[PDB]
Nucleic acid binder design. Structure first.
Ligand SMILES: [K+]
Ligand SMILES: [K+]
Ligand SMILES: [K+]
Ligand SMILES: [K+]
Ligand SMILES: [K+]
Ligand SMILES: [K+]
Ligand SMILES: [K+]
Ligand SMILES: [Mg+2]
Ligand SMILES: [Mg+2]
Ligand SMILES: [Mg+2]
Ligand SMILES: [Mg+2]
Ligand SMILES: [Mg+2]
Ligand SMILES: [Mg+2]
Ligand SMILES: [Mg+2]
Ligand SMILES: [Mg+2]
Ligand SMILES: [Mg+2]
Ligand SMILES: [Mg+2]
Ligand SMILES: [Mg+2]
Ligand SMILES: [Mg+2]
Ligand SMILES: [Mg+2]
Ligand SMILES: [Mg+2]
Ligand SMILES: [Mg+2]
Ligand SMILES: [Mg+2]
Ligand SMILES: [Mg+2]
Ligand SMILES: [Mg+2]
Ligand SMILES: [Mg+2]
Ligand SMILES: [Mg+2]
Lengths: 57, 50, 306
RNA sequence: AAUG
RNA sequence: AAAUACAUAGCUUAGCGGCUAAAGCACUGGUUUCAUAAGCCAGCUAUCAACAGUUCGAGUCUGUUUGUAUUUA
RNA sequence: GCCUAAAAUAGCUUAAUGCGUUGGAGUAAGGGUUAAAUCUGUAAAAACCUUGCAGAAAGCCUUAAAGUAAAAGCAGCUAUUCAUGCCCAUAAAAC
RNA sequence: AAUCGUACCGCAAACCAACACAGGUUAGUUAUUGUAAAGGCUGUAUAAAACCAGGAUAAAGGAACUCGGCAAAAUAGGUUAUGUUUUCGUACAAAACCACAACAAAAGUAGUGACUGUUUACCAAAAACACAAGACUCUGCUAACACUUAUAGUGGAAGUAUAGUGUCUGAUACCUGCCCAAAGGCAAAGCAAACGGCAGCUGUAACUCUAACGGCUCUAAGGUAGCAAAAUUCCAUGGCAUUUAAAUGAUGUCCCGCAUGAAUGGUAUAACAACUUCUUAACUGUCUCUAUUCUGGAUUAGGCGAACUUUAAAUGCUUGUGCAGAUGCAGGCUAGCUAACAAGGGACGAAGAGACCCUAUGCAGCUUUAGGGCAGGUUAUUAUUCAAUAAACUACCUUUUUUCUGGGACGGACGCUCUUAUUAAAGAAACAAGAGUGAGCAAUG
RNA sequence: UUACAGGCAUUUAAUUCGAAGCAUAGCGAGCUAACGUUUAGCAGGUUUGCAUAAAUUAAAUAUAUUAAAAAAGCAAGACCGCAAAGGUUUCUGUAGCAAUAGAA
């Protein structure tokens, strides 16, 4: 079997994942939306109450 | 055993096997579409609707 | 060779002799892992992966390896055959585990590098290693079972296993249950090594090996009592050639064995050689299995042509 | 150098 | 019933156109031995299924009448 | 304290022999019998000098066994475990 | 907080089967001691034929039925002292004893496979296949092998000779003999648990018989043990014993056995079997031999409304005749008319351009030491830093495999001369008959 | 000799209809065969080989121990059997309810 992905490889790929960030407003509450660089789908990740803008969480 | 029941309908199977997206994915399927345009059939694929 | 007297005696420790309560239990002999101290649970989460079964089908979707498929779920373990990463750091054995994909036993070892977190690895268990033992590798290690050293620091008569053909790729040669290899002599840059099959070969002195044998001495005493026992392992039944029709096999006809025994593709299978006469690796083989000199094999049809 |  | 082979001293076994004959056992006589066997020496069987042909000349080549196998119905 | 052809356990030594063994040199036989032949060789054997691999057995000491190991049995070297045997010095009021 | 589904059918007259088709169709829930809450559904008009189907009862006998206990019936269930066989786990026999209403169905003998399993959808479920297990051979890791145009890539396997590929035997117990000559294949000049083979004649022991024992020929070797009237035997229903009143049957035994035989395995074997064979107990409408009866159809009435088939018809018997078995032709006979209910002799009755056999400008699949080729792999030789050529082995491609004939096959025959019968001109056939020949001579011109 | 009408012949689908088949390219695994991933199902009973606990419960109470279904478990290609999956024998049916069904 020439193609196997071990847990160490899975974690390395997960840690090397890039995102595009966009701020949105919903019902007066600010949310952060992100899109994976290798996909075309956006999703709402978190709210500003749990995230600190300007850092790398 | 009783025969004659070779058709077991399935909507997902019908779209995946004979759909327009499938016919456009290969050169031979594209040629099939042209042949049906040349003959002038009103419905091109089982997947078509307005 | 299995005999019914062997099961009746019920002598060898470490085996489960199932009482003949049913037709499928009369000839069944298995291994008692609890009596041996071998762990038979789930593998380590960080050293294992769940994969689908292939059933002997390639990327073209056609069957290339016959009589496979239909068993239980498959899980693979990652084994470190080359211990070059942890050369200096000593390791402590935590458990000895059973793996249905191999015939030997695996050992779980924890390393504690200075200034870092503990590290876990799987190794092929040597013959006489139990939980709590200490394993060491690299220069400055004793010549004892479980130690990995280059061939330049191993005595001639010491049995070894898990030998590397290439300097750093990893051990490939001696892995099966209760097998070993020996060193006969050491030359300027090569050592003469006798392999488990009885072949004498040249191996570079910078390769590494593990002292001892493999850790399962009850492999040949097993007897599967049922057809379904091997079905659960992932093996399917096969049909004899003379039972088929002419369009399926060369033996297909009504008569049995009209022609000499051969493969389904017509190659004689009772002594015809399949190794290439001009194989590039002939420069490293001294004597083949059975005692045949390499030159006798390499130059056999050339003399007939002349 | 078997036999009586 | 057709088809392929074979009938050779007392018995196995050479021979298949120049004469109608080879070898081994058996049989007979002698020698050795207290005597019988083994061993040695010398002899003997007109030696060629039956009939009609071919040929200067046929056990030998061609047909028929008998006997024996082998295959087929 | 010493000894042991006693038992169990584990390491070590090689005279000779065998070969689908290495290199050198050399050319018709080698082997065997009452007498022969099968067999092995001349396509390079045996014999001679060297190389590699392997199993079994223990020359002189060595003699009974005189140890008697309970009988069956027991001697290549070294060590461990254990049981005897020798010297010297002790021991038991009831077994 | 947007977007899409929400009706109706869904064990069915609405989905899959051309149909309102006795067929097929997934999951989740509900009442009920001997019963059963909720909910759901509903059939033209009659009856005192034959006959057919599915049930019930039956005197006396109890397999006498039949290819065969087919079908039907049957105390069917539980606990046992004792005995037998075992692979020691099992399995079987058993006087007797114990049962509220429901549910109910044997043992032994032989043959073959160990066992549970699998198979020809639509005539074969088996002794066939698989199976755990035994053996042989190949493979040193970029393993052998398979897929592929392969220079890729992938399976083997992320496994490493206690492993993987191929082949034949087929649990287990006791066993498993000889041959590598010729023609091939493979290999290290050897290989049989690779493909295969494993004789004949003749003389001899008190009377007889037989041959313990001799002689000869030939071969690579000449079939050893075991078993044996077989799932194998032409004579054949072999001889003897048991079984029955009666035995082409079954079991036991005798045995060079047309043509048994040891891993294409030999001989046994507890358990197991909708497998084949024979027997015992019981039971019975299977039978002597049938009778009565219930339900549904047929049959009578109203309504609705098919199909096979049809050259034309006003369509008797009998013997003769004839393309050789006549409703229709010739002789001898036959005289109220049309249907209903019932039976099935004939109309060489209906359905499907006979499958058997032979004949083709035949077709197709399979096999091989029938002919030719090289276009994959292996192997051999040569050359450049994944190549070229091929009388080899494997795979693949393509082509050939007469006619005559008292049907075809088997056998025999096919050119050219002489002679016999079909009279005395010539000619004249049959797988009619009787004989020659495919040369010789330098002189035999 | 040239032209025209006719009969016959040669070549080209050449009097009409009819094979089993051969070659090239595409469409099919919603039936069926094997396999992959995910999911679900199998009443009620019977026989047998094993399994003991954060400290099982009592008595002995040291010593020596003893009794108890004191176990919310594993194993069987195990047995009688409702569903379910099959298709052993019989009868019915035979353009049939059905181009393979019904009852036992
Ligand atoms: K098989
Ligand atoms: K065959
Ligand atoms: K079963
Ligand atoms: K065979
Ligand atoms: K059966
Ligand atoms: K009629
Ligand atoms: K005739
Ligand atoms: Mg077959
Ligand atoms: Mg005498
Ligand atoms: Mg009665
Ligand atoms: Mg009768
Ligand atoms: Mg069976
Ligand atoms: Mg079965
Ligand atoms: Mg069938
Ligand atoms: Mg069956
Ligand atoms: Mg059937
Ligand atoms: Mg066996
Ligand atoms: Mg046979
Ligand atoms: Mg057999
Ligand atoms: Mg009626
Ligand atoms: Mg008439
Ligand atoms: Mg008339
Ligand atoms: Mg016809
Ligand atoms: Mg003909
Ligand atoms: Mg079961
Ligand atoms: Mg059952
Ligand atoms: Mg089936």
């Amino acid at each position: 079997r020439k193609n196997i992905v071990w847990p160490e490889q899975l974690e390395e790929q997960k840690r090397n994942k890039q995102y595009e960030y966009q701020w949105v407003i919903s019902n007066g509450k600010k949310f952060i939306a992100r899109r994976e660089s290798t996909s075309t789908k956006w999703e709402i990740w978190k709210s500003i109450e749990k995230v600190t803008p300007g850092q790398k969480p | 055993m009783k025969r004659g029941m070779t058709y077991q309908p399935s909507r997902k199977k019908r779209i995946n096997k004979h759909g327009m997206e499938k016919r456009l994915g290969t050169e031979d399927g594209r040629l099939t579409i042209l042949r049906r345009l040349e003959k002038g059939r009103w419905r091109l694929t089982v997947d078509m609707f307005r | 060779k299995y005999t019914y007297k062997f099961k009746q005696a019920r002598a060898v420790p470490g085996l489960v002799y199932w009482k003949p309560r049913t037709p499928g239990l009369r000839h069944k002999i298995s291994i008692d892992y609890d009596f041996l101290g071998v762990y038979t649970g789930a593998p380590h989460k960080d050293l294992s992966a769940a994969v689908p079964k292939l059933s002997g089908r390639n990327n073209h979707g056609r069957i290339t390896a016959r009589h496979r498929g239909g068993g239980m779920k498959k899980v693979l373990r990652q084994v470190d055959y080359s211990r070059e990463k942890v050369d200096g750091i000593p390791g402590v054995v935590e458990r000895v585990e059973k793996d249905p994909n191999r015939s030997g036993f695996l050992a779980l070892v924890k390393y504690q590098p200075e200034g870092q977190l503990p590290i876990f690895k799987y190794h092929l268990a040597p013959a006489e290693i139990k939980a709590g033992d200490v394993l060491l590798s690299g220069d400055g290690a004793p010549v004892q079972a479980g130690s990995t050293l280059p061939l330049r620091s191993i005595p001639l008569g010491t049995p070894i296993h898990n030998l590397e053909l290439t300097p750093g790729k990893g051990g490939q040669l001696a892995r099966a249950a209760n097998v070993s290899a020996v060193i006969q002599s050491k030359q300027l840059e090569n050592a003469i090594v006798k392999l488990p099959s009885g072949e004498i070969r040249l191996i570079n002195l910078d390769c590494r090996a593990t002292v001892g044998r493999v850790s399962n001495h009850l492999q040949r005493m097993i007897n599967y009592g049922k057809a379904g026992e091997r079905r659960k392992l992932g093996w399917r039944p096969s049909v004899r050639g003379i039972a088929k029709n002419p369009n399926d096999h060369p033996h297909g006809g009504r008569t049995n064995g009209g022609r000499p025994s051969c493969t389904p593709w017509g190659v004689y299978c009772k002594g015809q050689r399949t190794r290439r006469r001009n194989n590039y690796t002939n420069k490293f083989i001294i004597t083949r299995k059975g005692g045949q000199p390499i030159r006798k094999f390499a130059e056999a049809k050339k003399l007939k042509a002349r």
